[PDB]
Amino acid sequence: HVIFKKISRDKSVTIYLGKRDYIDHVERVEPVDGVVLVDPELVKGKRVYVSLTCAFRYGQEDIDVMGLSFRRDLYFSQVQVFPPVGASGATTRLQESLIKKLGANTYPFLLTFPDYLPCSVMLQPAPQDVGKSCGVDFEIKAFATHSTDVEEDKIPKKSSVRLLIRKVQHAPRDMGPQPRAEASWQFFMSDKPLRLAVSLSKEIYYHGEPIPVTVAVTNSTEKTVKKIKVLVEQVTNVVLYSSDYYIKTVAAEEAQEKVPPNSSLTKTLTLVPLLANNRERRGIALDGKIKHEDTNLASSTIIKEGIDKTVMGILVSYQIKVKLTVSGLLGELTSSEVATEVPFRLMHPQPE
Template sequence: MHVLLNGHGTQEHDILLGSLVNGVGLALNLQDIKIPKGRTSCARSGTGLGDAPCLQACREALPSILQREEWPSPSLPALGVGCATSSSLIQGSQHVCLCFLCRVFKKTSPNSKLSIYLGKRDFVDHVDSVDSVDGVCLIDPEYLKDRKVYVTLTCAFRYGRDDLDVIGLTFRKDIYVLTTQIFPPVPDQAPKTLTPLQEKLMKKLGENAYPFTFEVATNLPCSVTLQPGPDDVGKACGVDFEVKGFCAENLEEKIHKRNSVRLIIRKIQFAPPIMGPAPKSETTRQFMMSDKPLHLEASLDKEIYYHGDPINVTVNINNTTNKIVKKIKISVDQITDVVLYSLDKYTKTVCAEEINENVGANSTFSKTYSVTPMLSANREKRGLALDGKLKHEDTNLASSTILRPGMDKEVLGILVSYKVKVNLVVSRGGILGDLTSSDVGVELPVILMHPKPADGKYPHSEENW
């Protein structure tokens, strides 16, 4: 939901959108909305995001205003703030407020001649299909002269540092690139059908707005970032997706920053609706000088856990030996396979608990423990895999990679998985018992992901603010 305030905004803030509720416009006097003192212009340059005081004022005022005006749907769960520039929005010197049904992400080139509009920045991988990447590019035809305008979608794998490029070492590899020419329009490359958002944007932006749509392959990796160390500089390693618009005479021409625009997007996965059986593992250890074995069984209560949720680990011990279990160690490891570049495998412990539990000889034991892997406890670990993040936003531990049967793993770049390890520290007992202790352990696979939103609205999409 957009609320466009202050008709005297600059072109830099322009985020004019399209059809409203039931296709009807609504103009409201700003005197109905108690904008905080000193907040006469509430759009941040080039982002379309409003500041918090104005946003809160709109949230508080608009439901009652819409109800008074007999608006079809006075219930507004979320509102955003932007800035409108069209003179048609101003009646004399009176500021107006317009309510829109869409949120748009916009980025403009340094010379202000190209702008890209996207309805969302998170595109969901449903395993058997991926959301299309669609948007609109606004151009200045007088600036172009005889040049063309292209839009590309790139999935890239970054495995080095920016400073390595100075000595000739490549630090970025393009895994997947799609390119479309939007101006002059090429019939074979134009979208066959327009999304509602594209129609709204083109109607408001005018004849110099051109749509583009990319169908994303299903065998591409999700966005992943490898956490840099405290002293690392430059862009982080990992897999990222980028939508780029630029003007050039041909695709071989060098792209200049001043007349190009880049917008980072994310490819994400949500937990599947159907879970598999809960993981369970067991082992039996026979010790010297003991007639009977020690049996360890560990299990989880489900296969998939959501980020931030505790993982419940049930430990069952049947100790028929003459030895003593002194401690129980439970840890969660993240395994990162870099399969595209170096075939490296990194295992990092993201959560560890050590419990002093004495399980005597010829006895049994059963208890459930909870461990919660969190990024907040692992900020300093270099190379830890994180979910791809957008600028100035926080993220979380990387979600587990879900593979389709028969998928080529090498194309995926980085594979992420997790396992829970349960280890028993077993000693002989007595004063010198700890000197001869040994470990008995099992491992359990676990899937760590985000739940699919119940209302079908994803983060950073046009349905949310």
């Protein structure tokens, strides 16, 4: 946790934070504790506020590309820090240490997050996608405002600062039951079954953690299972403004083995879904800008019970897909494919 600051152009307002990323671990969300350092001469007669905004945005970003824009503020909170209102509550150690360092013109703020928000997520469409760029952004802003006898609500940019922050998904205390699937198929002209059972070791994996997929194929058919392929697919549903759908392979492995007619195979394949696995980063839900080094695949959405899921803006989910390629018998023109899917969740580790 490295302390950073930003100073307004006129030097009247400086905001300090202790970190950029705020952990959501379901049970609670870390609040944004910081301070504002004012220049008392330059804020005389003015009020200084600090706000936290969570916004869903939709629309081409490029400021030289004509196109609609949409924004919904999913959350907003604001406090007056100057003049002091006298209702600030207890300081954190961070705030205490900054107030000591910076002196009497330093004022604390604490802006909490509610329980009904998504985490940081954004997407940029690939060429064959029809939807537009969209995301969920979090901003802290400090600014001075005043009125003159000729103009009300003045908010000069030079007396304002903003810092972009993230809300990042870490694992809760518990997780769901072991992921399992079972499917069977009977093909045209034969009642002989092909059976596929799939299990994952557990229901939550962490970013970077290998995912062991255990596949059991029971092939009573006359056909050969020529290929066993296992994918991690990311599924993204945009649920405000435009109903956009994305599904993208973010890891893949193929077994060496085939399954001949009238035979069985159990195999475990291990996959690791990582943004680093593909050069193409468009059409994928990320937790940050394509460029940045701190950018990862977006964590699974975790919706609060009873919430209208549309308020999340963008829903991100993950699944394992197991695809079996099945040989054609004499007379058939092509091989065939069958598949089944197994959901799991992907996020950062439990908090320490």
